Amino acid sequence: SKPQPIAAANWKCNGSQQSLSELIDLFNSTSINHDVQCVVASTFVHLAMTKERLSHPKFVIAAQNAIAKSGAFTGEVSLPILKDFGVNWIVLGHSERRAYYGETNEIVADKVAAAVASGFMVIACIGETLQERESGRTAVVVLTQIAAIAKKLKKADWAKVVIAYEPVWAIGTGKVATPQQAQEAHALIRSWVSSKIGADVAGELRILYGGSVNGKNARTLYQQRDVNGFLVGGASLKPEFVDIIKATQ
Amino acid sequence: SKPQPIAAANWKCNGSQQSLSELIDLFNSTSINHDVQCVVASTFVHLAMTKERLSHPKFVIAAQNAIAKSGAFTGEVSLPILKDFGVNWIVLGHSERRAYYGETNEIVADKVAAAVASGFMVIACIGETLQERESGRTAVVVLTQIAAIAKKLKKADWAKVVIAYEPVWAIGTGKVATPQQAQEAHALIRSWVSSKIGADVAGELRILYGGSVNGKNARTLYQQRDVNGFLVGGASLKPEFVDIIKATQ
Q: Which of A43, A65, A74 sits opposite B12 (nearest CB)?
A: A74
8 Å CB contact between B215 and B173: no
User: E strand or H helix at A209, and its extent?
Assistant: strand A206-209
Of B47, B64, B73, the CB nearest to A75: B64
Q: In this structure, are residues A152 and A119 in contact, taking their beta carbons and an 8 Å threshold?
A: no
Q: How close, in Å, is residue A237 to chain B by CA atoms?
A: 12
Please name the residue of chain B whose CA is at the shortest distance from the CA of residue A46: B45
| Domain A1-249 fold | TIM Barrel (3.20.20)
Instruction: Tell me how far apart the terminal alpha carbons of chain B are, to the nearest angstrom.
Output: 12
B101 touches chain A (CB under 8 A): yes
Closest among A151, A136, A134, A141 to A197, alpha carbons compared: A151
Distances (CA, A) of A172 to A137, A183, B20, B71, B100: 22, 20, 39, 10, 28
Cβ-nearest to A45 among B10, B17, B47? B47
Q: Which of A13, A74, A82 sits opposite B76 (nearest CB)?
A: A13
Query: What is the Cα–Cα distance from B236 to B242, expressed in whole angstroms?
Result: 9
CA distance A24 to A1: 32
Environment class of B129 (CB within 10 Å of its CB; exposed 0-12, middle 13-18, buried 19+): buried
> Which uninterrupted H or E stretch holds B13?
none
CA B105, B108, B110, B116 torsion: positive or negative?
negative
DSSP string, A121-184: EEEEEE---HHHHHTT-HHHHHHHHHHHHHTT--GGGGGGEEEEE--GGGSSSS-PPPHHHHHH
Distance CA B142, CA B150 (A): 12
Instruction: Pick the closest to residue B37 from B165, B127, B123, B154 (CA basis).
Output: B123
Distance from CA of A101 to the nearest CA of B (A): 7
Q: What is the DSSP letter of B59?
A: E
- B10 marked ligand binding residue: yes
Instruction: Phi first, then psi: give them for residue B10, nearest 5 degrees.
Output: -105, 100
Q: Does A65 touch chain B (CB under 8 A)?
A: yes
Three-class DSSP category at A208: strand
Across the interface, whether the CB atoms of A74 and B82 are under 8 A apart is answered: no
Q: Cα dihedral angle (A73, A77, A81, A87), rounded to 10 degrees?
A: -170
Contact B212, B170 (CB under 8 A): yes
The candidate with the shortest Cα–Cα distance to B118, out of B58, B63, B69, B65, is: B69
**CA separation for the pair A57, A33 (Å, rounded):** 11
Residues from chain A that touch B83, judged by Cβ atoms under 8 A, are: none
Q: Beta-strand (E) ranges in chain B?
A: 6-10, 37-41, 59-62, 89-92, 121-126, 161-165, 206-209, 229-232
Contact A73 B49 (CB under 8 A): no
What is the least distance, in Å, from the CA of B53 to any CA of chain A? 14
On chain B, the residues whose CB falls within 8 A of the CB of A43 are 44, 76-77, 81
The answer to whether B91 contacts chain A (CB < 8 Å) is yes
Residues in contact with A106: Cβ distance below 8 Å, sequence separation at least 6, in sequence order: A148
Q: Please indicate if the annotation marks A196 as binding a ligand.
A: no
* CA A150-A156-A160 angle, 5° bins: 75
In sequence order, the 6+-apart residues with CB closer than 8 A to the CB of A168 are: A95, A99, A127, A128, A129, A130, A132, A211
Q: In what order do the strands lie in the sheet with B6-10?
A: B59-62, B37-41, B6-10, B229-232, B206-209, B161-165, B121-126, B89-92
Which of the following is catalytic: A103, A128, A166, A186?
A166
* Burial class (CB within 10 angstroms; exposed 0-12, middle 13-18, buried 19+) of B101: middle
CB contact B92 to A (< 8 Å): no
Amino acid at A116: V
**CB burial string A135-152: b at 16+ within 10 A, e below:** eeebeebbbebbebbbeb
Which is nearest to B64 in space by CA: B84, B27, B39, B36?
B39
Cα distance between residue B173 and residue B166, in whole Å:
13
Distance between CA atoms of residues B181 and A2, nearest Å: 66
Cβ of B78 and A10 within 8 Å?
Answer: no
Residues of B annotated as part of the active site: 94, 166
Backbone φ and ψ for B56, nearest 5 degrees, come out as: -55, 125
- 8 Å CB contact of A75 and B82: no
The Cα of B141 is separated from the nearest Cα of chain A by a number of Å equal to: 21
User: CB distance from B70 to chain A under 8 Å?
Assistant: yes
What is the least distance, in Å, from the CA of A196 to any CA of chain B? 30
**DSSP-assigned letter for residue B142:** H
Residue of chain A minimizing CA distance to B99? A73
For residue B48, which residues of chain A lie inside 8 Å, CB to CB? 45, 47-49
As a whole number of angstroms, the distance between CA A32 and CA A249 comes to 10
Per-domain boundaries in chain A: 1-249
B238 vs B2: CA distance, rounded Å = 27
Q: Residue A77: which of B44, B82, B85 has the nearest Cβ?
A: B44
Q: Which residues contact A128 (CB under 8 A, 6 or more apart)?
A: A137, A138, A141, A142, A167, A168, A169
Residues in chain B: 249
**CA of A166: how far to CAs of A169, A216, B156, in Å?**
9, 18, 45
Q: Does A180 touch chain B (CB under 8 A)?
A: no
Going by C-alpha positions, the residue among A85, A82, A46, A48 that lies closest to residue A65 is A82
What are the b/e assignments for A211-243, b being 16+ CB within 10 Å? bbbbbebbeebbebebbbbbbbbbbbbbebbbe
Say how far apart CA A242 and CA A27 lie, in whole Å: 7
Report A:111-130 residues touching B (Cβ under 8 A): none
- In chain A, residues 6-35 whose CB comes closer than 8 Å to chain B: 10, 12-17
Cβ atoms within 10 Å of B34's Cβ, excluding its own = 11
